[model samples]
Target: EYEIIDIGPFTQNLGKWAVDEENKIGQYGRLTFNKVIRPCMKKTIYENEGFREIKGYEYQLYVYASDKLFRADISEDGRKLLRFNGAVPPP
Candidate 1:
C-alpha cells in the first residue's frame, strides 16, 4: 500500500494573464511545470507532465511517472493540489 503523505497544494506563478483587447477572452500565460512541481515532488524526477484547461476558471495538472511510481493532479486558480496517489506494481 502506498501511504499518502503531505505532498503539495503549491502555486505555479502564472504572473499576469495576457489577452487581446478586441475579443477580451482568449487569455494565456507561460507555464513553468518543472519550476513548480519539481520541488513539490522531491524524489526521482518523473518523465511526463502536462496542463490542460478544465472548463471553468481552472486548469488540470497531470503529472505521472512512466511506470507506476506516482501520479498527481493539481487544480489551477485555487492552486490546490487535488490528488496525489500511486503504488508499486504487483507481481
Candidate 2:
C-alpha cells in the first residue's frame, strides 16, 4: 500500500484570498505534512530508485469540503486519469 507521502498546508486563502493578499498567500497555518513526513519519504524513494530518475509521478489527491469530497488523479506528464465528487455507499 502506498503511504501518505506529503501534504500541503490547509490554507484558508486558497483561491480568492490567495490572489487578493500576497502576504497571506500561505501564511496563516503551517505545513504539517511537509514538516513531518516529506523529507523521510523523499529520501526513501530517491534511494530506492538509485537516484536514477522517476517518471509517472502520479498524484491522487482528495479534499473533504463542507458536504462532499473532491478527488483528482493526475500523472506527472499531465494526464488526467480521473476526477469526481460525491460519496456512494459501497455495494
Candidate 3:
C-alpha cells in the first residue's frame, strides 16, 4: 500500500504531493443513469453523438473539455447490455 501511494503521486495529475495537472485528462467515473461525472461538462447539444448502452439505461457522457465525449444508451423495460450502432444528426 505504501509503495503504491508513493508512486501514484508522481504518475498522477493534481495530486496532494508535489505533482500537477494535465491538458488531456484520462479516465472517468460512470454512475447509474442520467447526468455524467467527468472532469467537466459541455454547454452544447453535441454535434456528434456518442455513448454506451448498459443495464437498461442510456449512460451518455459529455465533457466540456477539449478531450473526449461519451454516452450510454439503454432501456428500462428490458435491462441488458446491448451494442447498437447506426447514424445521427439527420442530415
Candidate 4:
C-alpha cells in the first residue's frame, strides 16, 4: 500500500491546478502533449492565430491546416505562441 500527506502549516495554498485531459494538457505553468510529438515536431508561428489568457498568463493558438486540437507555454515576456491547440477563444 502507498500513502502520502501534506505535512505543512495549518493552512496551505496548494495553488491552481490545471484540470488536464487526454488531448488537452495545461497545468497553469506547463504541460505534455502527443499531437506534435517532440523529438520531431516543429515550433513555428501561424498567420491566422488566436489567443486567450488567465490573470497574467496567456496562450496563443496557432492555425495549422494539418491538425486540430489545444495550446500552451505562452512566453514569459507575454510574447510567444504555441501550436494551434485550444480552440479559438472569444475576443
Candidate 5:
C-alpha cells in the first residue's frame, strides 16, 4: 500500500516558493491570474464575413515592467505549459 500525501498544501507552497525565490519582488510576489493576465476575446457575428473557429479562448499575459506581451491560444478547460513563445532571460 502507498502512503497518501496531501498535495493541496504542497502545490500552494510551491507557488509561493517560486515567486519568492525567483522574482524576489515582494510586490509582484502575488501570482495573480486576473491582474497580470486578462482574458480578452470576441467572436465574429453571423453574416459578417465568414465563420472561422479560431480558438475557444484567447489568453494574453502582459508584463507591464518591461513592456512585454505574450499571447496564447488555449481550450476553454485548461492546457499544459509545454512551450512558450518569447525571449528567454539569462540566469
Candidate 6:
C-alpha cells in the first residue's frame, strides 16, 4: 500500500548533515525522492508487478536561515522534481 507521509523531519536532518559536510552558509535543504529514498520503493513496486501504476505524491522540505528559504520537491519516483531557493539580502 502506497501512501504519502511527512518526511520533512527526516529530510531536515539530512539537510543538516549535508550542510555540516559542505560547511557552506545560507541554510541548506534537500528534496530527494529518488536519490535518497526512491530506489527502495521502486524495488518493492517492481517486485509487485501486479500492482502497476505507482502513485507518486508530492513532497517537500524546507530550511530557513540567513533570511532565506530553501525548498525542494520529491517526485513520485523519488527524484528531485523542483527546487526554489534564494537569499534575502538584508537592508
Q: Write the per-residue lDDT of candidate 1 for residues 19-60, one digit (tens) a residue.
A: 111113322122223322232322222325456433223322
Structure candidate 4, residue pairs in collision: 69-85, 70-85, 70-86
Worst 10 residues of 3 by lDDT: 14-23
Clashing pairs in 5: none
Best candidate, lDDT-wise? 6
Q: How many residue pairs clash in all the candidates, one count each?
A: 0, 0, 11, 3, 0, 3
lDDT value, candidate 4, whole model: 0.28
Residue 3 CA error for candidate 1 (Å)?
A: 30
The prediction achieving the highest TM-score against the true structure is 2
Query: Per-residue alpha-carbon lDDT of model 4 for 16-63, expressed as tens digits?
Result: 111132224433224332232111112333334446332233323222
Candidate 6 residue lDDT tens string, 1-55: 4344444456555444433433333334432222222211112233235566654
Question: 1-91 in candidate 3: lDDT tens per residue?
Answer: 0111222322222111111012222233221222222322112122243473322222222212222233223222343222222213121
How does residue 88 of candidate 3 score in lDDT?
A: 31
Model 2, global lDDT: 0.31
**Candidate 6 similarity to native, TM-score:** 0.33
Ranking by lDDT: 6, 2, 5, 1, 4, 3
Worst 10 residues of 4 by lDDT: 10-19
Q: Estimated TM-score per prediction?
A: 0.25, 0.34, 0.19, 0.17, 0.22, 0.33
| Prediction RMSDs, each to the true structure | 16.2, 11.0, 18.1, 16.9, 15.6, 10.2
Candidate 2 Cα RMSD after full superposition onto the native fold (Å): 11.0
lDDT of model 2 at position 21: 30
Q: Please, what is the whole-model Cα lDDT of each candidate in the order they appear? A: 0.30, 0.31, 0.23, 0.28, 0.30, 0.39
Preferred candidate (TM-score higher): 1 or 2? 2
Model 2 weakest 10-residue run by lDDT? 34-43
- Cα lDDT of model 1 overall? 0.30
| Distance from true location, Cα of 55 in model 5, Å | 12
Order of candidates by TM-score, top first? 2, 6, 1, 5, 3, 4
